[PDB]
Design a protein around this ligand. Structure first.
Ligand SMILES: *[C@@H]1O[C@H](CO)[C@@H](O[C@@H]2O[C@H](CO)[C@@H](O)[C@H](O)[C@H]2NC(C)=O)[C@H](O)[C@H]1NC(C)=O
Ligand SMILES: *[C@@H]1O[C@H](CO)[C@@H](O[C@@H]2O[C@H](CO)[C@@H](O)[C@H](O)[C@H]2NC(C)=O)[C@H](O)[C@H]1NC(C)=O
Ligand SMILES: *[C@@H]1O[C@H](CO)[C@@H](O[C@@H]2O[C@H](CO)[C@@H](O)[C@H](O)[C@H]2NC(C)=O)[C@H](O)[C@H]1NC(C)=O
Lengths: 75, 501, 501, 75, 75, 501
């Protein structure tokens, strides 16, 4: 199955450029910027989850970011 | 030499702690040691060889399936076992399946299938262990003076010809005294077992390529893994999960190969150094070392000479280097024994005065050939200044100009410094000489606070680090209570490690 | 006959509707059907045979170990696999063990051992499945009348002598009509698939013995289990857990056999019926059936005769039976054709009035032999009553006395009734005839309330049932209200099921 | 291992005496009446667990029975 | 009969691993995790015994653990 | 030696009490005594032999039944005794059974059966008694100094080589002075009768295996037990309970064997030491002793030598050990009379100051062979440091690195300490030397509080201990503040004993 956890977790750090430096910058972002363009929905109802959670301004915003961010994820 | 264009530069000013100067070396860069007691010595790491590796586990990149067969015992019945379940080497999965009536037996209720398939790997990937013993290093070093600038990069005289010695360093010998003939010998002591952070890195091979892998990655991955100790025939562990035996809803249970994964392991490996190898041994390239350079015996070979007559010409014209140093080639047609070459970076001429550091040490052209070359390099002051060569009315000069000054040269040095803290941490305090308190506690307060940050945080990088980073900086602006003093700082802690790039 | 001494007695006297009386049969007991105008028929179950069983799983009572070997790769490797890990059939356990230096190899931290042993079972225990199809029953039945009391228990001629008949009942035939020659034929309808509660009972064999086991026992037990469908050679599941590979702080990892378990399975089985078998087929003995007995055609084998002359004698003297009935042997020396025998239980002397039920139906001695025997039995009252036989001056009488009366005979009948509810529930409402509301809802309100009690409670018995039982009765006394009504009753519900004994 | 679960859980019920009727009556009790005679202790401190649990009379007694009873249990 | 009391009561204690170390860890637990999967019932009514016993929160919970625990065992 | 890899390590700092250091020994581990007055001595227990055992009771693992017979006297008539009731050796059970009528005799109420069967055991299990007298011990001990690291584990010589010595300790002699030739003799005093806690342990044998059993287990078990004192022929006690004579409701009373129990005793024994033998004497392995080691006369044999010339070249490269010590092999090619070997763990390079303890005492290579080996081991400081060997320009060094420091080394030592309290209690205070108050009362306050905890609690382990443990910790959070002081602590008391693992 999927598996094959991402070695980025423990990232060997030295001067020489690591395995994929280039793709590693946008690889976490690009996934999200797609999955939203496919489904606008989870954003549209996200605020509902937001406004009913934490109920203060920023403290109620961090959800609407955390939700739409955990949305395109499988964890 | 072994320097200049390298563009990752470290100048270490020293000649105090009796040549006790301690220096770090990174396969990317090189550090030049300038000490009045010495000719300026150029150190650079080259290749760190690892030898006498041993195999640990292995995996199957590409699965292959052979003979699929099955049987079923009808209604409740200890799933009739095929013979293929006794040989291992066969995947088998026992599932429940309806056999009704004309499936051959009453109670078209739920029976059981047992399907099995021979499982034979194709290609493989075999980790290997690297131990601190049987670890080597290679440090090439050279000395400016004035050798032929065309020799800046060569490996023909590795064991002969002016400054150019190839030093080996391996565990059972932290020290090697490199004898550069006529300059004496540079005392060199290095900790091989410490710097590179091994024992956590398995050496890994896909088809005809190589990597390094932090353990707790290569130890945990979900593929079929051979036990690794015996090559006679594979007796696998796992052997599922590269093979999915799945069914629909009738009488069938099918089985699929999965079409290797070889693309996954690649796209999986990230932040893993590339590596190459020649046979039983293999050559990484990522430098780390802590070398305490003993400058004790270095004999300037340019003392007790005359000054080379007048007859200096530029060949290829001067140039600017990186951190701002200048190089010069000069061809002295003066026919004389090996002789000293005057060079001074002068501010105007109202009074020929030395201005700015001359770092080649003492350029001395050694030939009788009546036409010779010497590459001397020097860092003049910020404002406009002259580079001057010779002391005779035939002397030739050049005008040269530096960009920034003062606060200019500090920022660029303040960034690279923090760059070291980013890439190294800990040992990054090891440039400074001797025992200085501020340097003593420097590694002191850092190693403790550091490891804690190497545990609490330390999950991931890129969009992972920045997020958990950026959110903290929010807590600094807001909150109320004092902790805000720590959080708003901790953000910078993270963001900087993300700002390495 | 097939009655009297059996001591588990059920009299059914409700011959109302067109011979619709419904009766339950238990391999322990027997029910006698006594209906005005119909000779009293004695039904008893004997043996319930099961045939065409199939094997399901199996186990290993006694483990045996063969060849123990091991290897170790020294610190930093994987666990070097023996060849014995590829054959299955071998237990193997990979553990971590210190090999310090003179253990042969540097790195004194922790290596790995792999020990393996061939595993070959000794004896076995093989479950078998029992399906409602290919299930049989055997019901022997007999009719009082007066046959020779010595014939009360015999089988040599279960289809000729007297009015005995051996009835088979198997699924594909709920009905069997037993033709008792000259008495007509007793219509008999039974539900084979319902009563005995099969499909939940695997048939189980240790060495040369047998049992029955509720599933969710035999399905879940921790021993090595063969897959059961193929007898060629065992390819085990489990394997472990009858073999404990254990080590001690050292270079060793040992392995133990465990010395069968055969004593465990026995001491484990509790509340499991014993069973015996005569080959492929096997004969349980625990009775349950719901038989609706059709009494329709039964001819009185004693009507239109004279009264046997005077010449009656007692042989062996009368006796009391169990629930209180009395048996009598009488030898009529009267030489006559088969003739009717007068018998009356009379309380008193002179005017002999009939007192108390005479249940043999009509005793008729059938022989020309001039000396014959007839066993007739009858239930007189409590008060000193006479048993009388004959009509002529030569008649002979006996005095007989019954113990209890009225409320006496009710309690003993109120206990046995509740005994049925105990180990019967549900169908225990099936003695009563026809469709009576109180009997209709009787099974009705019981089956619902019952199953709920067969789920919520129903964990265990003996000291398990009584405890959880006794604690509830406490709730009945203490507390406040509401539950105080249901709980204090529920205790009795449990305690009674514990009071079966 | 042990487990070998006791078939008494689902007890086949009919007129014929079951496998072990005799031993099944005292087999649950006799185990306790031994283990106490070996250790008086768990009883001695039981009340402490009792008196600090439920704190009312009977409601505090049911513990001191439940405890000393679960004392000789493997579960 | 059964009884055959478990020597674990007095457990000889020294460095060398005892007779069965491995099975001794789960042998008390595994028995319960089976007997419940066979009968959900004694749990379902347990709360009734609970809520009517001790009648306070935790003090009423310790029963529902003590009961379901004393349920699967000859104790 | 007899140390290093063992991985259960105890270092016992010197004792300024005149070689009065007291030490505990556990068959798992070993304690090394380092005392400046002495060469470092390695003590380890090996095998505790028990001899001259005597038999106590015995049991029958596997029952066997022979001849079943019965008779019955009918109603009024005691239970007719078979002849088989007079021989013992026969099980017999007198029960009540219905014999009605054609069972042969009137009075159909209830008679009596007497069934009997010969009872002959198969196999057996025979306890044996172990008394503190005729108890032995074996302590092998060795001394680091200079010696072929390949000899770290050997027995060939136990009476020769460098200094190894095999010491016996048995009751009637708590002391033995081990003479290690040339090092003097280590005064050794041990309490044999105290430590191992015998007299409570019967020695037990199933078929070809062994155990140990706390009494009040083996004294109370329900199986047939031979009286144990006479082997001529078994005259059993018990003899029921491995034989269940049972019968349903009929004319029969049956009898069952039970199919040994041999699997029960195994699965019954838990937390019982397994002991092997070899004839008349059985060798346990679980160590406990309290040995007060008298270090009085130990003569360093490495004093008054020169320093071995230059020719030191490591072999097997160094390594890390467990608790953090380092071992080194060195082959001094330079040949002379036994010559002392300089070794210093240096925190620098230039001026080599001693850093960190060197614990081999004084390594002295004894050979004239011109090529020799010496295994010296030493524990350097936490940070990076050099291991250095030699004094001449030909000296060879190695770089070595330690992981943790300070608070690091305390926790790991604070866990093992508490581990001792867990496994021992009481005597676990016996490492510390002399009479120190804190150590005096240390065993003092512990033995009292301990025994009380060895009585009140002490029922069982695993899921038994944790529960009764965990529930107490609840009382700490809740309840008043007067009892939650003791209770909330007592939980930790229990949980820790459960956390041994
Ligand atoms: C590397 O240094 C060597 C040392 O001189 C150079 O090799 C010389 O090359 C010239 C031109 O081909 C030959 O005539 C000499 O005989 C060579 N000397 C020897 C023996 O090595 C070489 O040019 C340098 N390479 C570079 C460009 O780095
Ligand atoms: C069992 O029943 C049979 C009838 O089938 C009896 O057999 C007859 O018994 C009489 C008197 O004992 C003999 O004179 C006949 O010769 C027998 N004939 C047969 C059928 O073989 C038998 O005696 C009865 N005994 C039992 C077991 O009760
Ligand atoms: C245990 O002691 C013996 C000597 O008593 C060592 O064995 C000797 O090894 C050498 C090496 O070749 C032989 O030449 C001797 O003949 C051996 N002696 C004999 C016959 O036993 C042994 O090496 C010691 N233990 C270890 C592992 O070193």
């Amino acid at each position: 199955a999927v598996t094959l956890p991402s070695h980025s977790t423990r990232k060997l750090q030295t001067r020489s450029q690591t395995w994929l430096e280039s793709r590693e910058y946008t690889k976490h972002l690009i996934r999200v910027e797609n999955w939203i363009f496919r489904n606008p929905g989870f954003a549209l109802a996200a605020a509902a989850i937001a406004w009913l959670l934490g109920s203060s301004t920023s403290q109620k915003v961090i959800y609407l970011v955390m939700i739409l961010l955990i949305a395109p994820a499988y964890s | 030499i072994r320097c200049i264009g390298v563009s990752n530069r470290d100048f270490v000013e020293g000649m105090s702690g009796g040549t006790w100067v301690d220096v770090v070396l990174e396969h990317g860069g090189c550090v030049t040691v300038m000490a009045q007691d010495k000719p300026t010595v150029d150190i650079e790491l080259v290749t760190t060889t690892v030898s006498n590796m041993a195999e640990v586990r292995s995996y199957c990149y590409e699965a292959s399936i052979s003979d699929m067969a099955s049987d079923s015992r009808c209604p409740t019945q200890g799933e009739a076992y095929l013979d293929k379940q006794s040989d291992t080497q066969y995947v088998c999965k026992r599932t429940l399946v309806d056999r009704g009536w004309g499936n051959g037996c009453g109670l078209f209720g739920k029976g059981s299938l047992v399907t099995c398939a021979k499982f034979a790997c194709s290609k493989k990937m075999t980790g290997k262990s690297i131990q601190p013993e049987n670890l080597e290093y290679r440090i090439m070093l050279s000395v400016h003076g004035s050798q032929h600038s065309g020799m800046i990069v060569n490996d023909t005289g590795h064991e002969t010809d002016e400054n150019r010695a190839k030093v080996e360093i391996t565990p059972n010998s932290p020290r090697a005294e490199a004898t550069l003939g006529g300059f004496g010998s540079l005392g060199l002591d290095c900790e091989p077992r410490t710097g590179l952070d091994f024992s956590d890195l398995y050496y890994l091979t896909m088809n005809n390529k190589h990597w390094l892998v932090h353990k707790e990655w290569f130890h945990d991955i979900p593929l079929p893994w051979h036990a690794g100790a015996d090559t006679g025939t594979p007796h696998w562990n796992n052997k599922e999960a590269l093979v999915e035996f799945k069914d629909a809803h009738a009488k069938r249970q099918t089985v699929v190969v999965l079409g290797s994964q070889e693309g996954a392991v690649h796209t999986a490996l990230a932040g893993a150094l590339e590596a190459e190898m020649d046979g039983a041994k293999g050559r990484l390239s990522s430098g780390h070392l802590k070398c305490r350079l003993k400058m004790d015996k270095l004999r300037l070979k340019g003392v007790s000479y005359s000054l080379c007559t007048a007859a200096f010409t530029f060949t290829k014209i001067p140039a600017e280097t990186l951190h701002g140093t200048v190089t010069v080639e000069v061809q002295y047609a003066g026919t004389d024994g090996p002789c000293k070459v005057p060079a001074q970076m002068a501010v105007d001429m109202q009074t020929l005065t030395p201005v700015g550091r001359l770092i080649t040490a003492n350029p001395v052209i050694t030939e009788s050939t009546e036409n010779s070359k010497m590459m001397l390099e020097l860092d003049p002051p910020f404002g406009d200044s002259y580079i001057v060569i010779g002391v005779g009315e035939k002397k030739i000069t050049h005008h040269w100009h530096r960009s920034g000054s003062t606060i200019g040269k500090a920022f660029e040095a303040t960034v690279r410094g923090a760059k070291r803290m980013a890439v190294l941490g800990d040992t990054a305090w090891d440039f400074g000489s001797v025992g200085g308190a501020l340097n003593s506690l420097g590694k002191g307060i850092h190693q403790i606070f550091g490891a804690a940050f190497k545990s609490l945080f330390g999950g991931m990088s890129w969009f992972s680090q920045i997020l958990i980073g950026t959110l903290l900086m929010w807590l600094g602006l807001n909150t109320k209570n004092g902790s805000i003093s720590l959080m708003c700082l901790a953000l910078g802690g993270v963001l900087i490690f993300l700002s390495t790039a």
